[PDB]
């Protein structure tokens, strides 16, 4: 039965009861249902008015916080020398929630999610090696859907953005914040996708299109300065308007790759493959036991 | 126009702030909602589902051997089986439970807890157990006559396989804290000891070693407050393929 | 009263004299796709009694050193009966499932089985960065075996697996466990061959043992689709 619960439940006083045929402390775990034994039935209690609020464990309050999705540093200089593996004052990031484990493990507590992505870009500039000063630069962040044609150059004509949504901001200005809606072609996102995307058998396991927000292209609009700088862009995402379904077990072992769920485990407990909880001497041993 | 002035805290980015921001896609229409089973609106729904405690955490136990507690016949009366440290937010057996993982995101916790043990021995196996709960301030009781002075239940094997041990909420404060001193008066929950009431008697044909499965859930008076980060996960390096997203 | 149970759907019927209060996942019961949730305009086909019935899979031996068994749905059923034919001729499907697992032993045997249906189970791999392959994930009717059931092969915890729809088979208490699964997915319908909505797991939480003369203990799973629908009629892709 669904109900509106704004606070923890009250406790009622119980008296001494010995009755045949009534066994409130017995249950059957084989049913899969959780034990319904009440504290009033197990022992003898007093009347308590419980005013503790449940509001802070709400999935809206729980899941919605600004967490770092991506952090990316690159050099700002004349790139006519450095090779192609280095960044040429732009970088393209495919938007994913799996890069950092604090937000990842927290979003993997549920099978499906429906939420709006509130994005924030925070930029920090430094000076490469004598000191000069921190310039005020204008950075463009253009939102490119997955699979579209992304800019190949800082000065390329792809940045005109007559259609793709863009945003302009300065280092001195407050961080730029936009709200990305819920774009999944389905009714919610699949945090875990069991299957393949493609009709051929060569597809990727667990990699699902329509769960990717898209590509985020960031450049430094200003032309390169006579002295090489170093710019670091940090992107934070806060979910909002959240609906969550089918809670899952929290992941114990550390993550390995963002593309899959593959596990390894530490060398020894805690969070080892064979032992999740650290080992004690024996089942009768109490590690923190008081001694006086 | 309207004369204004800035306040301390203007232009700052607070990760927990609640504000409306500029929509990136104008006139966008999200996909219609479809009914999906098992919606979780509040995280206290999850902690109320019983999950397996790992009591056997020790050496010489690998993998799934850690989720059960072996019970055998004994030649001496009044013997101890196992003891469970009750701190949820430490590294003890309660760490990996549903109630344990969700509670390690929060600093303060309140409300009653319940343990449930399911006897997996053969149908011909008989026995009686006593599940004792000792409030804090003392040492872990090593004897039954010292342990039965606290909240307990005496359990006899039968048709119903499971007994539920309520752990009541007993504190001088409304909440307890995670803080990494285990012996602090605001943290330590006390102890749980299990003794043989009578004995485990099995026929010669049945297996002499029988196992129990510890479960723990949270009641509907349970509460959590002051969210924090979870120590249960962390990374010293960038994950694999994280660089490939920048290609 | 909740001990004996009979399930009659289709031309097949299953009786069990030891059962506990069959589990209905998330309180939801299978039903056909309503008119307001329907994306596809073409008239769907509802074989009813043809595709809704118990399909018994191949029994697996239960032995002390057993690490557990898993079956993915619909994938386990795609080769079987008239349900397997509608899967091949039809682009889309929507159905719920009814799981019934049979394991029996003498009153002198001890053991426990966690029978759980994991929605959207994404399997991992131990000590490698390589994603699992197509034949590793898709086992057909035979089904696979857990490499590390302690972590559920996905890196999560087996201790918390009770958050999913589940029952137990405790050789003392009951000889069977029944789970009723509705349609779980983000999409209203789905392509049968690539995507699997459910993964049925049978895990030896408590190992088998006895001092009686050793015998073979099978574990049988009978899976019944419910409220099947199919769209996109074409030639059989198989």
């Amino acid at each position, epitope marked *: 039965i669904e109900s509106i619960i704004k606070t923890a439940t009250d406790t009622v006083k119980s008296e001494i009861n010995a009755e045949l045929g009534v066994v409130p402390s017995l249950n059957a775990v084989e049913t899969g249902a959780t034990s319904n034994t009440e504290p009033e039935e197990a022992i003898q209690t007093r009347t308590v008015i419980n005013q503790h609020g449940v509001s802070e464990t709400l999935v809206e309050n729980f899941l919605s916080r600004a967490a770092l999705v991506s952090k990316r540093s690159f050099e700002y200089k004349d790139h006519t020398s450095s*090779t192609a593996r280095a960044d040429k004052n732009f970088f393209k990031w495919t938007i994913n929630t799996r890069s950092f484990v604090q937000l990842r493990r927290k979003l993997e507590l549920f099978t499906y999610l429906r939420f709006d992505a509130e994005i924030t870009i925070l930029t920090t500039v430094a000076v490469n090696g004598t000191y000069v000063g921190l310039p005020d630069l204008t950075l463009q962040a253009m939102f490119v859907p997955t699979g579209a044609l992304t800019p190949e150059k800082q000065d390329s004509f792809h940045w005109q953005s007559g259609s793709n949504a863009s945003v302009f901001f300065k280092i001195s200005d407050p961080p730029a914040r936009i709200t990305i809606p819920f774009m999944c072609i389905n009714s919610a996102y699949s945090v875990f996708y069991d299957g393949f995307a493609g009709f051929e058998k060569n597809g990727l396991y667990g990699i699902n299109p329509a769960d990717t927000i898209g590509n985020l292209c960031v450049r430094i609009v200003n032309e390169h300065q006579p002295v090489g700088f170093t710019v670091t862009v940090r992107v934070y995402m806060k979910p909002k308007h959240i609906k969550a379904w089918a809670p899952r077990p929290p992941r114990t072992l550390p993550y390995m790759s963002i593309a899959n769920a593959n596990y390894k485990g530490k060398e020894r407990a805690p969070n080892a493959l064979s032992a999740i909880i650290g080992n004690r001497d024996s089942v009768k041993t109490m590690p923190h036991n008081i001694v006086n | 126009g309207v004369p204004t002035y800035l306040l301390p805290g203007s232009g700052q980015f607070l990760t927990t702030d609640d504000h409306s921001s500029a929509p990136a896609l104008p006139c966008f229409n999200p996909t219609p909602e479809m009914h999906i089973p098992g919606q979780v609106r509040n995280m206290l729904e999850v902690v109320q589902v019983e999950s397996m405690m790992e009591i056997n955490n020790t050496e010489s136990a690998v993998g799934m051997e850690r989720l059960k507690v072996d019970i055998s016949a004994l030649t001496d009366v009044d013997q101890l089986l196992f003891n469970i440290p009750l701190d949820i937010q430490l590294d003890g057996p309660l760490r990996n439970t549903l109630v344990g993982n969700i509670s390690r995101y929060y600093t303060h916790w309140s409300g009653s807890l319940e343990m449930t043990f399911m006897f997996c021995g053969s149908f011909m196996a008989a026995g009686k157990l006593i599940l004792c709960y000792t409030p804090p301030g003392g040492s872990c009781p090593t004897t039954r006559e010292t342990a039965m002075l606290g909240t307990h239940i005496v359990w006899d094997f039968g048709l119903q396989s499971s007994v539920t041990l309520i752990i009541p909420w007993i504190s001088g404060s409304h909440y307890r804290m995670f803080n990494n001193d285990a012996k602090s008066t605001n943290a330590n929950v006390g102890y749980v000891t299990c003794f043989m009431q009578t004995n485990l008697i099995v026929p010669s044909e049945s297996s002499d070693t029988c196992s129990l499965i510890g479960f723990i859930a949270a009641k509907d008076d349970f509460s959590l407050r002051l969210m924090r980060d979870s120590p249960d996960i962390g990374q010293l390096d960038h994950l694999h393929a994280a660089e490939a997203a920048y290609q | 009263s909740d001990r004996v149970l009979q399930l009659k759907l289709g031309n097949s019927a299953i009786v069990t004299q030891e059962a506990a209060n069959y589990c209905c996942a998330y309180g939801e019961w299978p039903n056909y796709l309503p008119d307001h949730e329907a994306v596809a305009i073409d008239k769907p086909t509802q074989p009813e009694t043809a595709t809704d019935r118990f399909y018994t899979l191949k029994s697996v031996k239960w032995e002390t050193g057993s690490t557990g068994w898993w079956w993915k749905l619909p994938d386990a059923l795609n080769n079987i009966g008239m349900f397997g034919q509608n899967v091949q001729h039809h682009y889309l499907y929507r159905s719920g499932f009814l799981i019934h697992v049979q394991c029996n032993a003498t009153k002198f045997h001890q053991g426990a089985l966690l029978v759980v249906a994991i929605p959207e189970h994404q399997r991992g791999a131990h000590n490698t960065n390589t994603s699992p392959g197509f034949d590793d994930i898709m086992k057909g009717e035979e089904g696979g075996t857990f490499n590390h059931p302690y972590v559920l092969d996905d890196g999560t915890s087996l201790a918390c697996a009770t958050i999913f729809p589940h029952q137990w088979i405790n050789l003392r208490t009951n000889n069977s466990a029944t789970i009723v699964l509705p349609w779980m997915n983000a999409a209203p319908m789905d392509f049968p061959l690539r995507h699997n909505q459910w993964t049925l797991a049978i895990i030896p939480v408590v190992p088998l043992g006895t001092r009686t003369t050793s015998s073979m203990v099978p574990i049988t799973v009978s899976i019944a689709p419910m409220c099947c629908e199919f769209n996109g009629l074409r030639h059989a892709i198989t």
Partner: antibody
Amino acid sequence: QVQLQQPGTELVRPGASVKLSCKASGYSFTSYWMNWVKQRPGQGLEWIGMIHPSDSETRLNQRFKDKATLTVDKSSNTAYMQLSSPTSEDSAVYYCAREGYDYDGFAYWGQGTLVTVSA
Amino acid sequence: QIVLTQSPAAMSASPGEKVTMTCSASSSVIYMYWYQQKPGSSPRLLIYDTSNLASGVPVRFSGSGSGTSYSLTISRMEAEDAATYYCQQWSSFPYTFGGGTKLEIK
């Protein structure tokens, strides 16, 4: 520093049991995998499968899984490779290789052995 | 089984010229790996993760590409560089290899 010592040419028979070892030195034998690759004359390379010496866990290619089985020894630090039913297709050059210390893709290779099937 | 198409199957180049190869994949992989196998020797790893160079690999070698298309680049060709070339995928099982590229110095 690491040296993978592999035997030389071995003549086999049509349906005998092929016995192929691989040697390891300069690194912990149980800390990494062992990977086997075949080379046909004037042909591309194909990957047979892997085995992990720690728990003796193996993972094989879907095609060669039935025609090959792997075995490891931690004491002698020697990994074994066994084939079944040698035929004209089984004549090839076999390499035993392992992952790089942080890099992927078989940075350390073997010296190879030339299998000659005759009847 | 992702099929890796290594194109072209053969090429000819003079010492100092720039040679470029393309490894096409039947699906989208993540990182691309590259090998050299001499005339009668064992293979060697050169480019891993489509960026870095392994030990003993001169700076002349290079690699790039993303999505389903990956390429190898050699700035200045040398006569000692004639051998077969392969491309590997780490993304899915089984590990699959390219068709091979044979080249000589004219």
